[PDB]
Structures are given as C-alpha cells and as structure tokens.
C-alpha cells in the first residue's frame, strides 16, 4: 500500500491523542516510568471515501492490513511499545479514525536538585518519518488527550497531562520528521521523608550536642562517634533511593553539612579534654559554654542559607 | 466480521465470569499481584443459530478466527494479559460460550494505614468498548465466578472473590464503555511481625529504660545510644517492606513516637549527670525516680491513644 | 480438527509421563521452582490407522498441525509452559506417541515449620478438559516417568519423583476435568546453616554470659548490649531467606527465645549494679552466682522442649 | 521430510562444532553462565547430491524448510536456545554444511571447595534423538570448535574450550540418544579477595589480640567484642556471594575457625579480670603472657593444617 | 533470493551508519549498556535498476521480503537486537537505501583502574559474513553516523560517537567476515563520589587521629575501633558498585592503604598504654607527640605517590 495522494503539494496531517489508562513504576535511579494508554490517530485518505446513500453504512471498519496507516513511533521509549488495535473507522469523506491500546517503558530525565521537595515533567515523544511520496506532519486533537481519574503514580501527585500543540519539524537521516511533546506534570509526596529520614537524622545530631553539657571524655567520645555512625547509615540509605547526580541535591547538601558539625564536635570534645588534662579547666569551660549556643545557631543559619539557595 | 445485529434498539449483553486457578506475588511496594484464571464469556449471535435436527450436532465448535468475539480487555493490568482459548461452543439458538485461560500482573492500590493489621480489596476490572454498529454492556454470570480451594496468597488470608453485578457504564474516546468490578478481599497474616519486629523493638526500648536505675553516665550513654541504633535498624528494615505513603501507617507512628522516648531518655541521662557533677544529687535523684514511672506510663497511654486513632 | 470418535460410550485415555532433565531455582520466599523436562503423551486415534504393506512405512510421523492432539495444561504453573515438540509417531493401529520438551516455573507451597531441617513435596499438576464430542481421562504410563541421574537441586537432596496413578476426575466450568499429581520429594541440606548461622549465634550468646563473672557494670552493659545487636543482625539475616509464615518456624522459635535470655541478662546486670551501689553486695553476689548455672541450664532445657515440640 | 536413507544398516553421523563469540554472566549462586556462539552441523544426504558439470554450481544453498535437518538440542540449558540460521550449503556428493548463531543460559554446577582459589569446567551438552527410520550419532569436527580471542568472562580466566570427541550413546524414552560434552575450563581471579576480604579480616583479628597487652577489662571487652562484630559483617558479606553448599569451602573454614579465636579471646579477657579481682594478678599475668605467643602460633599452625587439607 | 552479481570479481560494499536515539543503563558490575538507535545500510543491486522516464517514479520502495538484504549482525550484543524496518528505497541505478530502528544490550568491557575518575570507550561491532556467491565488505558512510543532542547517559558525560572507517577483514567458520568498530567515548561524572564517599571517609580517619591528643586508653580504643568499622562500611559500599577486577582500582588502593593507618593507630594506642602502665610515660609521650606529625605527613605523601602511579 502507498500513502494518500495530495490534492496539491500539501503535507498529510495526522491528528494525534494519548489517553492514559494506567501510569506506574517511576524509577528515580533509572529515570524511567511505565505507561498503559490509548493512542488515537486521524488522517484523510480520499481513496477510502464512499457514498453513505449507496453503501447503506455511515462508517466502514477496516483491518490494519486492508488500508494504509502512518508509521508512528515513540522517541524516548526504552523498547518498542506493546500495542493492540482497538478500532479503525472510515467516514464517508475518507477520514480514518484509528485507535490502539499500548504499553511502554518511557525514558524521561529527572531534576533531583530540590529532592524530596521536587516536581517533574515527564515526556512522551511521538514522532513520524516522512515517506518519499509525501511529507507527514503531526497535530494534537485536544479532546482525544486525557487521563483516567483512577490514574495513580505511587509516591507522586499527578498535576496535569497536556500536549505542546506545535510539532517540532526537523531533518532526520535526510527526511522530514514531525515530533510532538506530551507532558505529564507530577510533584513528589515528601511527607514520608519527614518521620523516616529528616526527623530521625536531626534527633541523632541533637543527641551528639549533649556532649557540650558533659565533662566525661569517655562518654563524649561515645556520644559523638556513635551518632556519627547513625548519620553514615542515613547518608547510605538516602544515596541508595537516588542516582549519582553531577550537582548537589537539597538532602545531599544538608547530609554533607551535618558531617562538618560532627567533625567540629569531635574537635571541641578533644580540645576540652586536652585543656582539662593540661590543668586549664577555665579555658575548656569557656569553649564548652560557647559551643552550646554556637552549634545550634550556626546549624539554624546554615539551613536558612541552604533553603534560600535551593528554593 | 461484524457484531450481531439487534432485534430492536437493545444493546448486546456479554455475560462474564472469572475463576481463579492460581493467585500469587502480592508486591506491597509495587501495589501489584499476579493472577492465573479462567475468563468465560457468553452472548447471543442469531447469525450462528442452527437446527439441531438438520445439522445433527447439539453444539457447534468454532475457532476464534471463524466468528465474532467481543473485544474484552482488563483496565488495571500492567501489560496485556497472556490468554489461551480453551473452548468456543455455540448452542442451537446462537448462544456462544467462550472460555480462555489467562495470566496477568494486576495493579490494584493498597491502604497501609493499619499495617501490618490491614485488610485489602484487590480489583480486577473488565471492560468493553461499544462498536459503531451497536452498544455492548457487560453482565455477571454468578455461577461462572469463583476460585479454586487450593488458591493461596503467601502471607495473606483470602476472604472472598465476588463481582459487583451492576457495570459502570461511561463515555471513553466518544463511545460507550461497560466496566465490571471483580473484588478479591484479603487480610494480612500479621503473626510473623510480632516475634520478628514488634517484640524485638519493645525489648530494646525497655533495655534503654534500665538507665533510670543507674548513676553511671558512661553506662547510661552506652545503654541509650546503642539501643537507639538498633531502633534505627528496625525503622530501616520496616520502611524497606513498604512504599512511600502520603499518610502515617500504624507501625510508622509507633516507630516514630519511640524516637521521642529515646530523645527524652538522652535528656534525662544528661540532666542527671550535670546535676550530680554540679553537686545536686538530691534533685537528680528526684528526676531519675520520676522517670521510672513516667516513661512506662506515658508509653502505655500514648499507645492506647494511637491504637484508638487507628482502629 | 475434532477428537477421535468412540467405538461405544467409552472415554478417551491419554497416557502421560514426565521425565525431569534439569531441576533448578527453588525460591523459598516465592514457593516456586523451575523445571526442564520431557512430557510424553499417548492415545489411540483410529482415523490415523494405516496398512504398513501399502504405505511402505511401520510408523508415520506428523507435525502437530496435521493431527488432533489433546489440550493438556499444567494447573500450578506461573505462566504457560514453554514447550517444543520432539516427536509425534503413529503406529498402524492408530496409536499416537507424542513427545515434547518443556520448561516451566511451578508454584508448589512449602512447610517451613522444621526449617532448616525440613523436607518438601513439590507438585506438578497435569490437567485435561473434556470436549463436547467426548470425555478425556488422564493416566500414568509408569515406564515414561522418571528423572535424569545428573538432576541436582542446589541446596536440596532429591529423594523421589513419582506420580499418583489415579487421576482426580471433577467438574470445571460445566465440563469433566482429569487432573494428575506428579510429586517430587526433596529434603533440605541443613549443613551450611550450622557454621554460618547456628554456631555464630550460640558463640555471641555465650559471650554475653561472661557478664556473670564480672562486677564491672560498664563492661557488662557493653557485653550484653553489643552481643544483643549481633543477634538482631542474625534474626534479620534469617528472616530475609524466608517468607512471612502464619506459624512459628524452628529457627524462628530459637531466635525469639534467645531475645528473652538477653533481656533477662540485662535485668540481672542492672540488679547486680543497683544492689552493689545500695551497699548490698552479698545479695548481688548470690544472684550473679545463681545466674552462672541458671542461664545455661534453662537454655539447654528450653531447647530440649523446643526440639521435642518441633520433631 | 524424512531422514537420509542408509546404504546399509549404518547410523547417520552428524559432525558438530561450537565456536564461542561472547561468554558472560557466570552466576556463582545460580551455577549458570550465558553463552553466544555458532553451532555448525554436517551430515551426508545422498538425495541432495548433484553433478557440478550439469548444474554449473559447485554448491547449492537451501532454506531450512527445503531439506531435512537433524533435531539437535542442548541438555543443560535453562530455556530453549535462541538460534538464527546463518547458512546451509550442499556440496556435489550431498554433504550438508549447516551454521546457526545461538544464545543460551547454560546450567553447569560448580565446586566451591577451594573458593576463591577454585577452577571450574563449564559444560555444554549437545544431544540428538534417533528417529524410527535410522539411528543418529554425534561427532566432533575439531577445527569447527573454538572461541573468539576477545571472549572475556568477568572475574575469571578462560583456559580452554575443547570437546570430548567420543559421544555418550544411551537409551532415552525407548530410543537411542547421542550426547556430546563441550568443556570450557576456567579459573577464578582471586586477586580482589585479598585487599577486600582476607587482609581486612586479618587486621581486625590482630587488633583483637592487642587485649593481651592491656590490663583494662573495659577496654579489652570493647576491643574483642567490636572486632567480633566486624568479623560477623565479613562472614555475612562472603556467604551472600555464594550458594548454600553441603561441604565446607576454604574461606568458609577460615571464617568459622576465626570465631573460635574470638571466643577463646573473650574467655582469656574474663579469666584475667576474675583473677585480678580475686587478688591473684601473678596467675593472670602468666595466662596473658602465654596468650601473646599461643594465639598467633595456634592461628598460624591451624591455617597450615587447613591449606594442607584443602590444597 | 541471491546476492547481487559482480560486474567482475569485486566484493560487494555495504555502506553503514549508526545514529544513537537513546543511550541508557550502563551497568558497571555487568560491563553492559543499552542502546536504541538507527541502522542505515546502502549497497548497489543492478537487478533493481530502472528507467525513471518509463516507471514515472524517481525511487522505488520495497518490503524486506521482496529484495535481497545483507545479513548484518552485531558481535558484542547480549541477545539478538530488536529491530524494526523504517524504510527501503531504491534509486534508478539500483542503489538500495535501508533504514531500521533497533535496540540492543551491548557488552563492552570497562577499565576501572582510575575509578571514579575514569573514561571509557564503549564498542558496537557490526559484522557481515560472506556468502558463497560473493564476498561482502563493510564501509562507514560518515554522514549517516551520529547521535541525538538529547542523548544522555546517567552519571556519565558523552564525549564522541565515531567509527573506525577501515574494517577488520578475517576468516570465520571458513568464510570471510568484515567487522566494523563504532566507538562511544564517555567519561564518568565523579562529582557525587566526593561528598558521599571520599570526604566522609577522610573525616572518619581524621577523627581516629584525635587519639594522639588523648591519654585515655578506653577513649582511644573507642575512637580508633569505631572509626575503623565506619571505614569497613565504606569499603563494602564501594566494592558493591564495582565488579571483581584482577588489578587495583584507584579508590581500592586508597581504601586499602587507609586500613594500614588504622592498624598502626591501634599499635600506637596500645604502646602508649603499655608504656604508661610500665611507668615510662616520658617514652610514651615522645611516641604520641611524633605520631601527631607522622600520621598526617605519611598519609599526604602516600596519597601523592598513589595519585602519581595512577595518573
Ligand atoms: C579456668 C576458667 C576456664 C573457663 C572455661 C570456659 C569454657 C566454656 C566452654 C563453652 C563451650 C560451648 C557459657 C559461657 C561461660 C563463660 C566462661 C567464663 C569463664 C570465667 C572463668 C573464671 C576464672 C576462674
Ligand atoms: C588467612 C590467610 C589465608 C591465605 C590463603 C592462601 C592461598 C592459598 O593457599 O591458596 C592455594 C592456591 C592454589 O592454587 P591452585 O592452582 O588451585 O593449586 C592447586 C595445587 N594442587 C593441585 C597440587 C592441589 O594458591 C594461590 O592462589 C596462591 C596465591 C594466593 C595467596 C593469598 C595470601 C593472602
Ligand atoms: Cl514505539
Ligand atoms: Cl487485557
Ligand atoms: Cl462519562
Ligand atoms: Cl456509543
Ligand atoms: Cl501449561
Ligand atoms: Cl536447546
Ligand atoms: Cl544482532
Ligand atoms: Na497498513
Ligand atoms: Na473474531
Ligand atoms: Na492439533
Ligand atoms: Na527441515
Ligand atoms: Na564503650
Ligand atoms: Na531479503
């Protein structure tokens, strides 16, 4: 079969629409998500036109084999989409109405800078390669673009599913290509991070600061070192749920900065002991008393500075 | 092939039934379960009707290819179901009796609020899209809905497998869709959680409270800090078997609250030491003696309050 | 094609046999195992009968497509078996001799009560659904049931592979079904558990009891708490290699009971210190001296009781 | 199609050869490896013979469908090999030269007794089932057996890829079978184990022995218990990279024996303290001084004994 | 179909080109990466030549089935590439222009010596086996070799995608083979390693050195042993993200060397205590004072030596 012939030198417009049925498995480490949707296509093939009076019928169904169907592909999919044709319906003027149900693992990158208080724009790119007979251009039929109400992405809030109506027309391997951008806007559900990582991590830090109200070196060493190990466990736990970024994430920055606080606490604990042993407990007392105010104040200000730079 | 023609303007009723053979792999993190069942369909196609006297046979078998079969799909499946046709049998009046065996990874969400003392309702949604010739409506043949006695879901108790007999009729891509709800009611086997997580977690907490019967700061610091680390391990172990929820789970609440008890224990231990050093052991004694009653009582009451709010 | 016609009202007997080639991947958590075997089938189709004098040949070979082959399925498989036909041979009387080589992930449940000193019976269920023309019944040709000598199931000892010769004939979706039970009896290789989990776990417990020969509270607290943490790690390690059971496993019981020994050791350590501080070292001495005999004796008796209840 | 006819009662010899392109994914836990190779087959079919003068051509190509090809299968593969026919070429005498490119997950067992200083022989078993017309026997065409120079198996050294030229001819499901053994000899690259597991494990043990030069019970308890926990971590890390064996591995034995050294160290530390407290520091001194020589000497001799038994 | 006939004895040149669409999943442990690209092929088949005047058309499209297409395979792929033909276009002279879109898991080895400051050259090997009719040789059409601007490999920087224009012509199973080398040059994004592994690891080491400003054996033992355990966790964490190499990696060397620093710190701590107890605090003071300079200086120089040897 060949593509529909042009009336003049005009390109063939294939109207598109994606309707999400099931949205699932957003892998932060892999920067992928799985989708299960409907793909609707519509174009005019004058060769298929018929008289509704003579033929009796208002629409004619066809099997994919019987007629010409444009080769529509997804750009950012991992492997080729699994698709099954739901319906093909031709109206008297020759307007074809194609529908298929597909599933695909889509590869759209993520920005972890404000993690876990981040929002993402997932992309689904539809493309079409022009044939030698005639050039093919994509379009968005807006009322065939949507999502099911049940659509739930675990640990995320689905904000919107829209399409950038103007296609990106460009050259690809010496032929015209018409690319379309479907955008799924989502925002992370940060709530769980607070009682599971943030608050436990702050509690262990504050426990390390009880060493500023203790003269026992043996006890202080235990307090600051033990809590430092628990902070290492939280750093490891966090960096497992995330990929290796060439930038600093919000949680990454806080976690890093907290190490400096543990390091300075070890210095103070060591200085206090050295001074007490050196028979200078007056000077050691001054340092310990100062640290009680310095550590919380510097921690609070440094966090104001970080939140400011990141948000 | 085309759909059966209507006697009048009535829709075509496709009677359905699902019979579970094997039920397995309930992923709490993914909110999926795997199923292996029979799907039975029945509708009347007058075009297939025959005289049993003239034809000799009481029923005629057909291959899927030969006749019209309604396109029935599952809504909440991950990928398209793996199905194999067992039998297609037509009675003299034209009543088709279709049977297929399928397997699918079903995506039904879970409510972890009462975890691990939770009960779930897993869903299997059957759907059918109306064609241009005539509208298709789903029905439940209750005699063809069931499950095998051997059906076992590891770590869960299977309560019931029933169907909501009235379908959800709605518009989908400008055509009528008839959705059916098959519900598998299950309840978690919480038994293992008691000797593996709950009792070990309470034992380490009670061990931390032996610091209220000790004047040794070095020993208390070791007792409260060491047991706090074991509690961190249990928090990490628990949050691995579960997904990130935008709400507080029952175990999540208990685990969180227990951190506060460790934090207050560190404060008491620090206060006792400061006072003893400051030559005020009488005041330190009062605080330590009070804590012995306060900590268990506040723990017991806070748990009564939590169990009340969650159940 | 249609099934062979009956001489009288007799059912069609399909003789079966399974010969295991490779047996592997027994997942304790999933209660599945993978199998690679031969499935042999034999039935008489008088329609295929031929004169060996006239046809030249003593046997005729056919492609699956050419003749009627009974639809034999496995009940407890995860997804549909991967099968490849090795041979189909028809003798002059019409006796068909079918051979296929298949691979499948079989879902047979396990009893972890005596873990890791448990024995299992894995099941492979063959089934056949009767057609409208005539009823089909399964049989076991014992000469075609076996296993290769090389058959090795990692971490398990293969005892026997036999078949329950009498099929389970029952109604399934309003038609007769003939089910057959192939049983693979295996027993766990418990050896590795002894130097990797059991002996390391006993060593750490006995180390905790060296606190009954020490008056140093600071040292005792370190001894009992540190070893309790190592026991937590062993409990976690063990519960990872196993699924969540609604019953107590043998190792589960020992692991649980050992927590009580750690808890009572903390009590003794605390009592000894309180008494020594309260200027009652005579009473503290009596308790410590008693514990030295009590702890090993109670541990030994409790283990005799457990081994008795479980075996 | 039927197999080639015999001149007399001789069997048909199918000459074989495997040439490895890519060798990868040796799973120690699963005892599997993945292979990507060429399979070459050659046999004489007199029916295909032709006169090169009359036909013009020196060789004739055929599609698998056109001619008879022996059913060659792999015994120890997991699932059926993925194969694609590269070429089929017939010489004037009727000698067929078949070539296919395949990939398979091969299941060959491993001997971890000398781990990580072990060498393995991976097996690829080719088999052929005799037909009723005539018996089929396998052979090795040695210059069609090889491997690519680039062939690399991560963490292993590939020594040789050869075939046991004499096939194993035996009865299988009442027909003759010709099995061939292709052996891939490999040896583990033990280098990484030394700086990552062996030396770190010895360092922590030697650190525990610094307790023989200390009279501080509190410090000794910390030294021996802390290092014992690090040894537990190494035991866990090692047993994860390996399957559960019914025998003792080399590393397994060393790891186990090291626990006894920790146990005896705890005993010595306890005895020293009891004696010092009991006002017998002279006797405690003798034991501590002896342990300084005993522990390293017994460790060194026990290791000589182990290396001897294992190598 | 047969290959194009030669004008004279010349070989057939198949011009190639790979254009990367999506590049993802670089597994360091497995030494694999997944690719999703276009494969373009071009060769002259005089049999397909046509007169553009008589035929009307300037180019003719063909289905893969209709014409002869060279069997091009990838050497270092895991399983056979997933490919879908985009276009086949013939010009009047008979020049065929083939285009297909494929996805494959490519197995290219990696050099971890400078990890995580390493650069890699990933390979994609295209090959072609000569037929009996005529020899086939590969070529690189440089205008049809490229990559998309959006091409992103998570945690890596894509430097270049080029091809070694001269093919490797060699014998394979007694026939000529033409191999082509496509090289994807990438360099690791080491940034994340600094705040997550390197700086945390140095902080814990420096904390261990605060024992040179302390006379408390009990505190020193806690300081050096606790920090040694955190270093063990970092060694384990690092060796999980990497495969077992027969050489020393950069991070591997630093990690190993740091163990020696912990071991010598334990010796110093032990010596200081023994001497103080032996009533030689003057000598213990000299050693402790020296260690304060020795440890940082030796650490800094040893690191200069390592960086020099590795870079
Ligand atoms: C002379 C002391 C020898 C102690 C030997 C202990 C052997 C235990 C063997 C267990 C085998 C399983 C059960 C744990 C006992 C801890 C031993 C404490 C020793 C205290 C010694 C006091 C100095 C007189
Ligand atoms: C505690 C410390 C344990 C050290 C174990 C030493 C290794 C060993 O003794 O290993 C033994 C292997 C043997 O290699 P083979 O070829 O299989 O010898 C087979 C010999 N027959 C056939 C005669 C029986 O020697 C090596 O790889 C030596 C280099 C490794 C040294 C690592 C030191 C750290
Ligand atoms: Cl696609
Ligand atoms: Cl479906
Ligand atoms: Cl609606
Ligand atoms: Cl409608
Ligand atoms: Cl099956
Ligand atoms: Cl095979
Ligand atoms: Cl390929
Ligand atoms: Na088409
Ligand atoms: Na149909
Ligand atoms: Na058949
Ligand atoms: Na054939
Ligand atoms: Na301590
Ligand atoms: Na072709």
Numbering used by the authors:
A (entry chain E), B (entry chain A), C (entry chain B), D (entry chain C), E (entry chain D): 5 to 315
Can I see the authors' text?
At present, the best structurally characterized pLGIC is the G. violaceus ligand-gated ion channel (GLIC), of prokaryotic origin. Each subunit consists of an extracellular domain (ECD), predominantly in a β-sandwich fold, and a transmembrane domain (TMD) composed of four helices, labeled M1–M4. However, the GLIC is a pH-gated channel, activated by lowering the pH, with a maximal activation at pH 4 and a pH50 around 5. We instead found that proton activation is a complex multiple loci mechanism, with the key contribution stemming from the coupling interface between the extracellular and transmembrane domain, with E35 acting as a key proton-sensing residue.
In contrast, mutating only the three acidic residues (E177Q-D178N-E181Q) produced a marked decrease in pH50, whereas the individual Asp/Glu residue mutations show Wt-like responses with E181Q having a tendency to decrease the pH50. A structural analysis was performed on E26Q, E26A, E35Q, E35A, E67A, E75A, E82Q, E82A, D86A, D88N, D88A, H127N, E181A, and H277Q mutants, by solving their structure at pH 4.
